[PDB]
Swiss-Prot record, chain B:
NCBIfam families registered for this protein in UniProt: eno
Catalytic activity: (2R)-2-phosphoglycerate = phosphoenolpyruvate + H2O
Cofactor: Mg(2+)
Binding site for Mg(2+): 236, 277, 304
The record's free-text note on cofactor binding: Binds a second Mg(2+) ion via substrate during catalysis.
Keywords from the UniProt entry: Cytoplasm, Glycolysis, Lyase, Magnesium, Metal-binding, Secreted
Assembly with partners or alone: Homodimer. Component of the RNA degradosome, a multiprotein complex involved in RNA processing and mRNA degradation.
One GO CC annotation: extracellular region
Active-site feature positions: 199, 329
Protein localization: Cytoplasm; Secreted; Cell surface
Protein known as: Enolase
Species annotation: Coxiella burnetii (strain RSA 493 / Nine Mile phase I)
Amino acid sequence: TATITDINAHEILDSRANPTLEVRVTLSSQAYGCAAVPSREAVELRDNDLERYGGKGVLQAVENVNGPIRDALLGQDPRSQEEIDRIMIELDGTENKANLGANAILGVSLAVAYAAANNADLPLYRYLGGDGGPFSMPVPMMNIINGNFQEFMIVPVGAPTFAEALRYGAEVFHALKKRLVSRGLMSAVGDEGGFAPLPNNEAAFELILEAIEDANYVPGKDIYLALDAASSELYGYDNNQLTSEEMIDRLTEWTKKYPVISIEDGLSENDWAGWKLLTERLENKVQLVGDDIFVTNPDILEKGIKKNIANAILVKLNQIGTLTETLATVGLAKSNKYGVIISHRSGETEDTTIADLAVATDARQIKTGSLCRSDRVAKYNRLLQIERELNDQAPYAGKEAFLF
Amino acid sequence: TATITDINAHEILDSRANPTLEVRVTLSSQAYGCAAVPSGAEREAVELRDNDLERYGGKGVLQAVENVNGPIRDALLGQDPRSQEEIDRIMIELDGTENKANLGANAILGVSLAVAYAAANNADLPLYRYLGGDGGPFSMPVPMMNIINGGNNLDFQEFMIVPVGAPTFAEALRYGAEVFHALKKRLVSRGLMSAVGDEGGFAPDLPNNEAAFELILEAIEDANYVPGKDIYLALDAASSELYQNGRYDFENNQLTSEEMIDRLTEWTKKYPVISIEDGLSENDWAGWKLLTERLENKVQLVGDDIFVTNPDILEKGIKKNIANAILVKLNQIGTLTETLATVGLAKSNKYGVIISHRSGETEDTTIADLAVATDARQIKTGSLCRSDRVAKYNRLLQIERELNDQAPYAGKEAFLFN
Ligand SMILES: [Mg+2]
Ligand SMILES: [Mg+2]
C-alpha cells in the first residue's frame, strides 16, 4: 500500500508574473503527483515583503507546505482525499484557511489526488469520476471582449464535439480580430486573452455577432452569447446610477434583444433581495450564474438555493480551498438543478486540473478564458486529449449542459 | 532495450489560436514521450498546413498529423529511440526534400522531439539530463525578455531586458518580473496602453523607437535595479521586415545599410544594449559584413532570419565573418539532430547561442531543457506574462532547484563577444 513519503512546494510564477506555488506529493511506491495553484473567499497567503515581488511572494505559504502541512500528512494514504483534506482544514484551524493559506492547502489537496491517480496509472478525470463516470465534455464559455461589464463571451452550444466547439470559437476569435483591426480599434489582449476596445456596453455584443456571422455560424443555434456583469463591482449600480430593478430591466432587455444564454453576477453579492426578483423573472429564460455571491462555498450556496437565488454556480477550486469541499459544492449544485461551471482564475498556470475536473464531475460547462495565451489554451488542449481518449463515452454536453 | 512500438499525433491549438500538432512516441517498455510543435510569424524548413479555407482559415494540420500517423510511424517502428541521429536521418531521407516540404517540418520535428522524451522517460531522466548526459556541464541561461513589442507605431520588433547581473536564475526571473510590473504601473498611470502582444509584451504607441528603451530604463530604475549592471537591454530589429531594395524603412524614412548601422551604433553607445538581433536584412550580407566589422567587439550580433538555424548557412556566415551569435529555433530546421549540429558549430566557432521560442508557442517546455543541456547560456522565451512563456521560466526554476549547484547561472559568462 502506497503512502505519502514526501511533500515539497516551491515558488513559481503565474500567468500574470505574480508568484504562486507548485506542489509535488511523493508516495512510497515512488509514484508522485504535481499541482500548481491559480490566483468573501478563502484567504490566500502572501508574504507582503514589499522588497520582493511587490509584496506578492508566497515563500511563507511554501514553508507551510514543506513543514507543518508535510509533517501532518506523512504516512497517509493519498486515496483518502476527504480525510487528508480534513486533517489540513483542522490543522489550519480557521474558517478562513488564513493560517496555513488556502493556496498552501489547495496545492497539496490537488497534488495528493494526482499522486493517487498516477499511482493507479489513471488520468485524473478517471481517478475522480469512476470507471464509471458518467463523463461528458463541457461546453466552454469563451471570454472574447472585456470591460470603456467585465466579460462578453461566446458559447459554442451547437457543436457536435468539443474539438468542433474549440474550432468554432477560434474562427470567431480570428474573425473578430480582423474587424477590430479594420476599424482601427484596439486588438491587444488582457489577462485571460480577450480584446478590450468602445462606446456603450451594448456595442460589444454587436461586434461579436458580426464576428459570428462573418465566420458562417448562426448566432441562434451554433453559438450563443454569455456575459459576466460582475455587478458587485458596480454597487446602492454605476453609466448612470441604476437601482436593482432598473438593472434587472436592462438585463431583461438584452436577453430579449440578443441570444444571451447565460448571465454571471447580474446583481451585487450584497443584493440578495435584487437577486430574488432577477431569478424569479428570468430563471426560466436564461442561466443565472452566481459567482461572487456564492464563492464556491457550499453553505452559502445552500442558503442561495433555499432563498431562490440564481440557477447556476461558478466553481473555483481556490475560492474554497480543498478538493473535497469543492466536490461538495458541485454535488450540492447538481442535487438541486443548478448549473455547474468549472472556472479558471485571472492568474492561471500551465496546470490543467479544471479540465479533468469538469469531465470527471459531468459538470457540462467550463469557463477557462479567451482563445490565446496557453494559460488558457493548455486547458482546451487537455480537453482535446480527454475527448480523444474517452471518445464515445464522453459526449459533448451541448444543449444538455443547460438545465434552466 | 526498448524500441518504438507506436507513434500518434493529433491536432491541438497554439498560443495564438492556430492549429499545431502534439506527438506521443510509445515504447515496448510502455514508456512514452510527448512533444508539441511551435509556429513562427525565408530559407526555413516548410511547416505543412492544410489550406482548407473552410477550416481554421486554412491553417489546419490534419495532413501533417496523417504524415506522422502513417508513413513516419511506419518508417520508425522498431527503432531504438536513443539513436536520435539515425531516427532523424530516416525521416530526412523519407521526406527526400531539402525543405522537408513533403512530410512537413512540423510533423518531422514533433516526432524528433517526442522520440527524445520517450528515451529520456525510459531511462527515468529529465530531458536536460538525458540530452546533456550524466556529467553535463550544465548552466542556467541568461534570459532575454521581450517587454515591449513592435513591428502599432514602433519599427523594431522586440525591446528586451537581460538580467545579466543576477546571482541565480530564480533571481533573474524576479528581476524581470519586477521590471515588468514597474513598467505596467507606469503605462497605466500615464493612460498608455496596458494590453499585450503575442509574446506578452506591452505595445504602447510611442513618439519614437528609442522611447521604448527610455520607458524600459525608467522601469528598471523604479524597481531599484542598476541599468548596465544588474540589467541590460537587447533588441530584435527584425530588419528583414523593414528592407525594400535596397534601403530600410525606419522612422518614416529610408536608410542605407550604413545609416542603419550608424543608428544601431548610436543606440549602443547611448544605452546599455548588450545584444542586437537581425540588425540588417537576411538579404543584405554585404551590410552584415560591415555591421560585424564595426560592432563585433562591442555588442552581441545575433543572426536569426539570416541563418535560420541552418548549419550550412551558419558555416557560410562564419567564413564571411557575419555576426557573432545565432538564434536557435528547432522548427526552423526540423530535427533535434540538425539543431544540435548548428549549436555545436556555433560553439566551436565562438558564436553566442540563444535557444529560442516561436511567436506561436505551446505549453511544451523543451527549449528550457535544451538550453540547460547544451550549456547554451542564453535563452529567449518571451515576456513575463502568458503561460506560453512563463511555463518555460517555471521549468527553468524546477531545473535550477534540481541541479542546485551543478547549474550555475551563466551571467556575464554568457557573453563572449569580448
Ligand atoms: Mg466573475
Ligand atoms: Mg527574430
